Structure formats: structure tokens, C-alpha cells
Amino acid sequence: GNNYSYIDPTQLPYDHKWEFPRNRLSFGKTLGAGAFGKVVEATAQGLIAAMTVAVKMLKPSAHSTEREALMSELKVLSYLGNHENIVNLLGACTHGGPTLVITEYCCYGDLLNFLRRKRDEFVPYKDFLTLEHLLSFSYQVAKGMAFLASKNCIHRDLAARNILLTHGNITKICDFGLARDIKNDSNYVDKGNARLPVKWMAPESIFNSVYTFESDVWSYGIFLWELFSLGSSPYPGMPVDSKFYKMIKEGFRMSSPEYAPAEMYDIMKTCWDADPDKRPTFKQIVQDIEKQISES
Ligand SMILES: CC1(COc2ccc3c(c2)ncn3-c2ccc3cccc(N4CCC(N)CC4)c3n2)COC1
DSSP states (O other), X not given: OTTOOOOOGGGSOOOGGGBOOGGXXXXXXXXXXXXXXXXXXXXXXXXXXXEEEEEEEOOTTOOHHHHHHHHHHXXXXXXXXXXXXXXXXXXEEOSSSSOEEEEEOOTTOBHHHHHHHHGGXXXXXXXXXXXXXHHHHHHHHHHHHHHHHXXXXXXXXXXXXXXXXXGGGXXXXXXXXXXXXOTTTSSEEOOOOSOOOGGGSOHHHHHXXXXXXXXXXXXXXXXXXXXXXXXXXXXXXXXXXXXXXXXXXXXXXXXXXXXXXXXXXXXXXXXXXXXXXXXXXXXHHHHHHHHHHXXX
């Protein structure tokens, strides 16, 4: 009985099959900077000639616990494996300097800014943005999240800003700094003291700091609202304050975006069930969207 346990991927050794020499890595422009650190475009010569990649790194002032967390994220990505709809791990630099995590590069950037740029040219039916594209995006994000859940992982920051768009209109979930394997407890209780994405969070995460497969599903529902509203900020007209929390707890939910199909707003509503047990799984969401695509 006690001779069997769940292998914790963050306790496994770093596998040097990922190691890439930093003297073949040339940094280009900065792609983003924030609590996650710094992300740059780069060329990784000979990782496969020259492929364009993204490289995540910490600020030079970073704490030892920040540095350990980047190593832990590397181990999580190493254990997770490859999927079409995530920003995949390609390599790392783990000695001779600060840790660098090398991942796929997505030339169109984040989906939120993409949507906000294409808002004015959007037309529901027929390059330009159409209802068909938005359904495809909903499907691909659900497939990436189903994959994470099939590996017993939660992302904890699902939002349009953390979805990237690459060639062929393929969407990829990015930023795994907060992702966790929850095989042992079937939840995660956040002990951190960082700023949190309150308007994307399930009420049980706000109130009790508990994260689960089902709280990722809540966030997916908020993502759907962002998507079909073409990049509107969620809960318009509502600051994050005592009024906001009271309303969410009492059962307030956002109305449908104008261009959301009724069956997609139906998914949103089940993602936001107050009872986590009544929310759908990503597996169920994928099957639902599949059938909507086929019926279109
Ligand atoms: C639009 C252009 C392209 O932009 C980009 C941006 C990030 C790009 C990118 C192309 N390929 C990849 N990544 C990544 C990769 C890992 C990341 C790990 C953590 C955080 C990230 N980001 C993106 C979203 C987040 N909300 C803010 C920081 C990350 N990004 C073409 O010139 C910019």
C-alpha cells in the first residue's frame, strides 16, 4: 500500500537531453515582461539551421525561490510532453548562467491583442475574422486544456492574454509558471502572496485559495466571454471591490456577448456554476464544441 506513490514531476532530476549551449542562442527583441519574468525572441542555431524561438528568463535581481520555481516549471513542462495546442518546451540553458527556458515562438502573439486589432474588420460570415475562426479557437484551447487535465495538471492563469496564435491559425496555451500537478491532492491551495487575476478566478479560488481542474474550467468560461466579445475586458463597469465579490457569490454572471452562439453561451454558463461538481470537464467541452463545428 504505502510502497506505491504518485511520482512528483518537480522532484525528478532535470533531464539534460533538453540542454542547449547558450553560445548558440542569440537574443532579439523583448516579447513581454511582468511577474513571470522576461520573454524574448531568439535564434537557437542548430537546435533542430536557425529556428526562431522564445526564451523565458528571470530578472537579474530574482530571489532564490523565484529561480527554483523556474526550474520547477521546466520539470513540469518536461513531464507534460508535447501537444499541438500548448507552447511547447524546446530546450533549456541550466548552467554557465541563469536558467533560460526555450519554447516555441508564435508569430501573431497573444490572442487578446489579436482580437482587439481585428475587432473592426470582424464579420460573422464570409483573410478576416469570422465566427468560424472563433469557434476554432474555442475548440483548440479546450483541446490544449483537456491535454493538461489528462496529465493531472492545472494552469491557474487561463485567459485570452495567455493564448498565443501561430501559423495556420493554431492557438497555443502559454505561461506555465503557475501550472501544478495535482495528482496527490486533487486540488492545490495557493500559499503565495502574488497579485492574482481576480476576474478570471473561480469563487472558491478567491475565497478559499483552492485550485482544481474545475477552477481552470471556470477560467475557460471567462476566456470564452473574452473571445466572443472580440477582446472586451470581463465584467465591464465593475471594479474589483467588495461589491464585485458579493455579486459573484450571490450568483451574478455576465450576459452573453452579442456574437456568441447560444450553445457557446450555454457552455459559459455551465463553466460558471457555483458548484464545481456541476461544471463540465474539458473532455466534455471538447465533445460539445466538436459537434457544433460539425453542425456548422
Ligand atoms: C506579436 C509578436 C509575437 O509576440 C509574442 C509574444 C510572446 C510569445 C511569442 C510571441 N511566442 C512565444 N511567446 C511566449 C512564450 C513563452 C511565454 C512565457 C510566459 C509569458 C509569455 N508572454 C505572452 C503572453 C503573456 N500574457 C505575456 C507574456 C510567453 N510568451 C510578433 O512580434 C511580437
